């Protein structure tokens, strides 16, 4: 499924992301454009193997198991394909995760290069939140 702007801001909203660990809801729905263009089925594979899934990109290295990454950890206990559902509460559970790892977002490469450091109140504008 393709996210509209703010109909996924209210989608991260509600499954409790806003000022989640201090990060405003616009780094969210920034860092959702960037990584996947608000498509949950979006997938990339890295150079080591590895390969990233859903709108917000969730590395099979450590965070979830797709079966063809050697030496993966599964930190958040779920097979990647999981994180390609229409429902993005897996994707929410599991960024949580990530973002409480000690990087904070920057562990989004998107975010760290086209987020942070900007206006992100301007992804959540017009919105009815």
Same mark, same amino acid.
């Given at each position: 499924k393709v996210f509209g702007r703010c109909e996924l801001a209210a989608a991260m909203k509600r499954h409790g992301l806003? =000022?989640? %660990? !201090?990060? @405003?809801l616009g780094n969210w729905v920034c860092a959702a454009k960037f990584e996947s =263009?608000? =498509?949950?089925?979006a997938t990339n594979r890295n150079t080591d193997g590895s390969t990233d899934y859903g709108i917000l990109q969730? =590395?099979?290295? &450590? &965070? *979830?198991?797709?079966? %063809?990454?050697? !030496? @993966?950890?599964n930190l958040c206990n779920i097979? *990647? @394909?999981?994180?390609? @559902?229409?429902?993005?509460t897996a994707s929410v559970n599991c960024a949580k995760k990530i973002v409480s790892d000690g990087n904070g977002m920057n562990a989004w490469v998107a975010w760290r290069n086209? *987020?942070? !450091?900007?206006?992100?109140?301007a992804w959540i504008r017009g919105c009815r939140l």
């Open positions: 806003d =000022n989640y %660990r !201090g990060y @405003s =263009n608000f =498509n949950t089925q969730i =590395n099979s290295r &450590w &965070w *979830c198991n797709d079966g %063809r990454t050697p !030496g @993966s950890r097979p *990647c @394909s999981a994180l390609l @559902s229409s429902d993005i086209r *987020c942070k !450091g900007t206006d992100v109140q």
